[PDB]
Amino acid sequence: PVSMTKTSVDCTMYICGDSTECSNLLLQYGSFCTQLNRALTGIAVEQDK
Amino acid sequence: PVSMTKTSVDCTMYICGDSTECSNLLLQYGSFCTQLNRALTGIAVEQDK
Amino acid sequence: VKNKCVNFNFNGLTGTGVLTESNKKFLPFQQFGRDIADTTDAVRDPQTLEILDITPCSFGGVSVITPGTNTSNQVAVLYQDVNCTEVPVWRVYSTGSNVFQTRAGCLIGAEHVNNSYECDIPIGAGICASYQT
Amino acid sequence: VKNKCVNFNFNGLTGTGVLTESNKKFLPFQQFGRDIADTTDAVRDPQTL
Amino acid sequence: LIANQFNSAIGKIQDSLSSTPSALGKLQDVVNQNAQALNTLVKQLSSNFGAISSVLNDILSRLDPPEAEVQIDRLITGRLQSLQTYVTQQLIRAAEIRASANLAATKMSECVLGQSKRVDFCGKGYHLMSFPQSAPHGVVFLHVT
Amino acid sequence: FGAISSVLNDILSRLDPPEAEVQIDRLITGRLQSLQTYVTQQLIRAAEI
Amino acid sequence: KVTLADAGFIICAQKFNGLTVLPPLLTDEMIAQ
Amino acid sequence: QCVNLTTRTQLPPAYTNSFTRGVYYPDKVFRSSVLHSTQDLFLPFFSNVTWFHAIHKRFDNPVLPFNDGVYFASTEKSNIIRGWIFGTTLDSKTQSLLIVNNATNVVIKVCEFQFCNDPFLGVYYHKNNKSWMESEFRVYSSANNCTFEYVSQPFLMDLEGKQGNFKNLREFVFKNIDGYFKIYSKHTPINLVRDLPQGFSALEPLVDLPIGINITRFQTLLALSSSGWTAGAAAYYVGYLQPRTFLLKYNENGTITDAVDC
Amino acid sequence: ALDPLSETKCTLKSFTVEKGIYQTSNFRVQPTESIVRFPNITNLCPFGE
Ligand SMILES: *[C@@H]1O[C@H](CO)[C@@H](O)[C@H](O)[C@H]1NC(C)=O
């Protein structure tokens, strides 16, 4: 094997799917969604490398 | 590369400083901080190894 | 008060640490001061116009060094990350027969020698401890 | 109306999206249609069946 | 002639490292990553996590012990979860660094201490020898080919 | 997850915000921890590949 | 050429909440030896 | 007493590009050489703002809405704008805020007034003594129920002055949150004809008031028998605030040096 | 709470300890006194009138 398919999951549209109050209540949880997106983008760059 | 920087985290002073009642709330959670210090200790040994 | 770890309340801002006269140049409306960590480290005294640096007072972990209990019952202690001029804050190994200063911190209970051998128990910064005559 | 991103409200069941004509051959006792993720994707209009 | 070519190549190596500033990036980012990991750890301290305040004292100085356990429980859960994430990341990264270090030790044992016949193991071309140089958190091989 | 439903819009269609937050906290907890599990498993598999 | 990213975030450097960095067992000099 | 002034030149309203203006310190925490992001009510960069001016033929003082703070700038010579009115209806069905920059005092109060159609203050033009004496104070018709007043130290200020270029660039922003009025400001020496400049300037926090009332509309006040008048040139610009998210950079001494819209 | 050797026996849960280094008993200098600071407030209410 060489690589896998590069995937990406948007945090907010996954969890609080098109809700405004849900995004606001998500906002108190720090910075998880940035960390998740950073990890996934690092994986996707690594596959092409 | 060869090694990263070793680092260590004191669990209780991280979680809550100075509040002994927070410690009373923490001590019902079992022995998590033992696991945390054990994992970081293993990493810090493997760096020098 | 100054130069001791105290817990404080400056105008609703509570904390603990040692206070120092600072050199930071505030703007006149500025009261607090923060870090890149957004952690308070600079407080303007309400009574008199001055800048106070806040340092959290020191701490650390205890390292304990021993041979096997099949061998001996004497141990040594490393207070990490501390220039051990304020060591004693068990108590019996707080003033015992020497203190030794390393880049790791303060070593108490071992006597510093001049010769160099191979490493036995890795303490740090090229410094190792062993049990010998 | 059809073929627009709109807000819709069918029998209290609300959402946002685009409505189009289906070919799903329902049986008369059925009203809704569901997905793997338990999301509505096929709705019988109460006024016109 | 070989002496002249060798000395010229060494001088060009010095010039190439002193010119291009984007060379040591493989070392640098790892350090940067650890730094920002620690950085974002601090940034999880000041979240509400659904509790009333992120200041522990202000919850203690305003809400009563019949009810304050509910808020501080939320604070416990959030901070514990952040520790979980941080050390899981550290474990994976450390395993990766260990793999790269084993590769480095193999390269030091074969390319430097002897002459390997594996093609393109010790750089491009037919391998002659290697010299190691120390580096902050790493090693730099100079392959002579 | 122990709440009334797994549908986000139905809870906002029926509840006041001071109880919508009560349900949505549990929902956001469950979904977030599931996503955490997924990203950790993906990291391990990427290292293997 | 090698520089740290953030100043003070890699001798009195003790972090405010429980973060410590352990010095390596081998220093700079004997590795060069 | 208060009369209606009619004789003017009629013009359509003008807009001007607020390039990068209207930044203020969000708090009182000192930083040093720090890129920090906040999210707050701000004037967006590169919007168009309402431009009003008193020239020669112009007395342009309407009532403007106040929602979520406003940013008010003025290019002026000899301090013709003097006051600010605030209130929901300005007519004693609701409480009313009065800010006056008198030649003697600055008067800050809230009572229950009924203001006129064209409230203003009127100063004469060189009445054989080389002084412009302020003579007319035509603001409200009564002061019914009062709740809070303040007057500062008396002083003197020049009520006369003519320049080919305005020197005063006074910048203000006003906010109301949870019963609190926030006045944030800056003064700048300037040399420009009929425009607002390009550049960076922070606003220091100046005044907080714990008032506790609902505010919807406002109007400023101008310096100048019932018809027949002489006013110097002045101009002002009005922009509105929107909840935005910014990045700010702090220098080593801790002044906000530049800003980034997200 | 007696001696460092006994502290190692207490946290490793054994009556035998082999040779090496261990990490126990994180400490703090434990500050001495309290202090509060406030502005030099002088604007009294005239109760004499
Ligand atoms: C702002 O107003 C000016 C007035 O001339 C107009 O030209 C411009 O298009 C306007 N811009 C926006 C974004 O409305």
Author numbering:
A (entry chain C), B (entry chain B): 728 to 776
C (entry chain A): 534 to 622, 633 to 676
D (entry chain B): 534 to 582
E (entry chain B): 922 to 1066
F (entry chain C): 970 to 1018
G (entry chain B): 825 to 834, 850 to 872
H (entry chain B): 14 to 69, 77 to 244, 254 to 291
I (entry chain A): 292 to 340
Verbatim from the authors:
SARS-CoV-2 spike protein plays a key role in mediating viral entry and inducing host immune responses. It can adopt either an open or closed conformation based on the position of its receptor-binding domain (RBD). On newly packaged virus particles, the trimeric spike protein has a pre-fusion structure in which three receptor-binding S1 subunits sit on top of a trimeric membrane-fusion S2 stalk. During viral entry, a receptor-binding domain (RBD) in S1 binds to a receptor on host cell surface for viral attachment and S2 switches to a post-fusion structure for the fusion of viral and host membranes.
To this end, we introduced the K417V mutation into SARS-CoV-2 spike ectodomain and purified both versions of the protein: K417-spike containing Lys417 and V417-spike containing Val417. To stabilize the recombinant spike ectodomain, we introduced six proline mutations into its S2 subunit to lock up its pre-fusion structure, introduced mutations to its furin motif to prevent it from being cleaved during molecular maturation, and added a C-terminal foldon tag to facilitate its trimerization. For the K417-spike, 55% of the molecules were in the closed conformation with all three RBDs down, whereas the rest of the molecules (45%) were in the open conformation with one RBD up and two RBDs down. Further 3D refinements using the good particles generated a 3.2 Å map for the closed spike and a 3.9 Å map for the open spike. The structure of SARS-CoV-2 RBD complexed with human ACE2 showed that Lys417 in SARS-CoV-2 RBD is directly involved in ACE2 binding by forming a salt bridge with Asp30 in human ACE2. Simultaneously, Lys417’s direct interaction with human ACE2 boosts ACE2 binding and viral entry, counteracting the limitations of the closed spike. Our study shows that, compared to its closed form, the open spike is more effective at binding to ACE2 and facilitating viral entry.
